[PDB]
């Protein structure tokens, strides 16, 4: 009832503020919307009609157009009646209907801020193009347009700009299952360059896409930078499935100047573990310096999700600031009443604002696209409707332009003539590649290379009456250089696609785990026997073996025993213990997953039984592994 | 709670009283803000700007600058369809 308290005050604030600035907003937007052309630098019917418009607007009034720019900046600063602002009614708001957005607080509301600063200086234009094409006398509306943006900014920098959070996590989750196959993952950005955003995307297979780029000056991002990334055992990766799932839940947190480069999740045993690494950018200058900070994920704070029939609810969206910025802080969370996953970052677009814009210098803020920039399949939407890059062999196969994903021209084929492009350079060798493409009709794509029969990919037989998106998978492995796309038609039908994507996913590394324990490093005390792969105490003497060991420090380990008889081990440190067991009379065969949390030293395994006039028997163990 | 209904009760309230009283404020605020100098106690280019802005000022009009003035009157005392002030 209180939250719904909130929401219902933070409707009626928005109430007031419509009531007070709704009418100048909508006479800003007609005007703008009216006089486009002209400030974008029939005819003589057009331009009587836009000259009896700037008539109607260069009109001195009451409720001039002047009038309703100045009642706009007022209710905009928060010279009113009661001395409220649009702007922290607008921030309230937002903070409020956070649901699903992508960025976070500060980012979205500049963004409302720079829409509404855009809306004002387009209208000073447009008035000042109007008094232009009546022909009276320039007033110079720079000053007055200067006065009103930088008076709002300074609104903003001061009243709300505070208040507002800094960190942006995944908007939508998504059901997905995923395989505990000892998944390891490394999301590195080139040594000088930045981690700024990334975007996880589930159509028929979950994919993530990582930006990457150089940095210029107070955190700014260079835009003849930017490069992408693709990965694609990202479901694999956060996923339980069948058996259960840990997460090492924790929010890394560097000081200013520093910047994520990389990001490692190594899940080992069904535990989820990411190490982040932050390399040191100087904010006066645009390079950033080999001086790295690694931090882990702690150990005290970890959360499972049980085994559940249905999968888990893994992030989707893009998860980055409404523009693209370094990221100062990530972390991963999980819920197990509902099973959620969340990714939450925290970027640097605070400072970016209050060093650059916020003091009235310039800015080019890139906002993330909502496109592959990595596609090696030029004109892949097919929106350009000269296919320079695609061809038709036969007279035939062409653009329909009816047909595609709604709005744009798609390739066709009908008899035997199929529409091929050129991609065989823009390739690797063996390197896994993901396809994708939206299609109608009776199909048939094929990946081929004119110089031996090799044949990468190949979709044929589908008949998609309506539109239908296929993702698949595969790998290369020929000469390359003379590889290329093709789309014709099944046997002799007739068929259309569009949206044609080619994706190089990067490598994924197997994860490596060390034996750890050999058998010539057997510190034996007491009667005790060492046989080739196997170790026996023998009852009666005070002997025990204990072995040293080399443990990463976060990081899990699964320990395997056959033992036989009265047996205990203890895994342990001089002042903490990782793990203890005495299995008693009943120790056949033993996995056991134990942690190092924050030691690495002086870590050793004692398999040991104290007892006093047990003599004659003997306890065996076999095959003990550390992995 | 209650402490949060009687905020949202005076902003409704308030609400209402913008309604009545928004528009006649941002004019007489605009007309105010714009003849300064005159009442105060490129020459020719700001007296002809003013004086078309006094002529849209002193016409009798239903919509007029007295219009405003009465209205923001009537809202300040309480002569509105409900007796709010």
Redesign the interface.
Known sequence: ??DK??I??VN??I??TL??IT?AYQRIKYVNEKFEELTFADILDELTELTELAKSVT?????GFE?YL??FH?VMVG?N??GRSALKTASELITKENVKTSGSEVGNVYNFLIVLTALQAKAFLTLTTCRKLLGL?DIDYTSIMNEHLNKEKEEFRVNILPTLSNTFSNPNYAKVKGSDEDAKMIVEAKPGHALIGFEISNDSITVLKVYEAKLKQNYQVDKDSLSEVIYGDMDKLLCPDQSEQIYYTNNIVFPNEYVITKIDFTKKMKTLRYEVTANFYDSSTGEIDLNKKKVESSEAEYRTLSANDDGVYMPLGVISETFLTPINGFGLQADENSRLITLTCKSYLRELLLATDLSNKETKLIVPPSGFISNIVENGSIEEDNLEPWKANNKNAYVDHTGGVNGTKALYVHKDGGISQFIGDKLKPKTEYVIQYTVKGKPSIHLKDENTGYIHYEDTNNNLEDYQTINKRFTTGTDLKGVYLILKSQNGDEAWGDNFIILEISPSEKLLSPELINTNNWTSTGSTNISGNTLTLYQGGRGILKQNLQLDSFSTYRVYFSVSGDANVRIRNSREVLFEKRYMSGAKDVSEMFTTKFEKDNFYIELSQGNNLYGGPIVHFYDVSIK
Request: overall charge negative.
């Open positions: 009832i209180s308290l909130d219902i005050n009626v604030l109430n007031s009531t007070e009418p009109k001195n009034d009451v409720d009038f100045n009642t007022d010279n009646l009661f006398a």
